[PDB]
Design a protein around this ligand. Structure first.
Ligand SMILES: *P(=O)(O)OCC(C)(C)[C@@H](O)C(=O)NCCC(=O)NCCSC(C)=O
Ligand SMILES: *P(=O)(O)OCC(C)(C)[C@@H](O)C(=O)NCCC(=O)NCCSC(C)=O
Lengths: 82, 82
């Protein structure tokens, strides 16, 4: 993930919030993420996680059980929604 | 809560889900629910909840941290939203 930069700065991909919501619904459904067929709609990105070499960055996903609304919150600030 | 029936049907009050959502937000915030000023919007009572007299009913209120989307549910059935 360090090999994805934009003008030197190292950003978290915009498709990383899809594989994070897709790996959190699979857990919610008790299935392996590679055996679940998902369809995310109206995915929005409000900020950009700033990676850093030799460091650890944490992010909290939260998928609403029935309806299917998901967050990728990083504390109190939203990094993505859909 | 059993002293509220509609032609013999003992239903859970529509404002019952308002308090459950109100108390859940306070528990998420850590504050006491009586010290919290809330505002629910578009509270749909998706389906009716028939309270079981002389028994116990379970709900699974869920509030999204930042957006505020709350949801009262029982198993895989939706009972409220907003
Ligand atoms: P201002 O114009 O208010 O800034 C809005 C920003 C922060 C740009 C926000 O709306 C945004 O789009 N952030 C970046 C989204 C992102 O994660 N992009 C990186 C992955 S895609 C790639 C080719 O960069
Ligand atoms: P169908 O046409 O799908 O029926 C929809 C029903 C079952 C009517 C559903 O919308 C429903 O039960 N809504 C009522 C929720 C409710 O009971 N609210 C008030 C609490 S009881 C009271 C006023 O005594």
């Amino acid at each position: 993930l360090l090999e994805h930069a934009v003008d030197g700065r190292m950003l978290f991909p915009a498709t990383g919030t899809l594989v994070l919501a897709w790996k959190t619904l699979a857990k919610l459904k008790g299935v392996e993420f590679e055996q679940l067929g998902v369809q995310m709609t109206n995915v929005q990105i409000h900020q950009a996680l700033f990676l850093n070499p030799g460091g650890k960055t944490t992010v909290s996903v939260s998928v609403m059980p029935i309806t299917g609304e998901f967050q990728v919150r990083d504390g109190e600030s939203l990094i993505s929604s859909g």
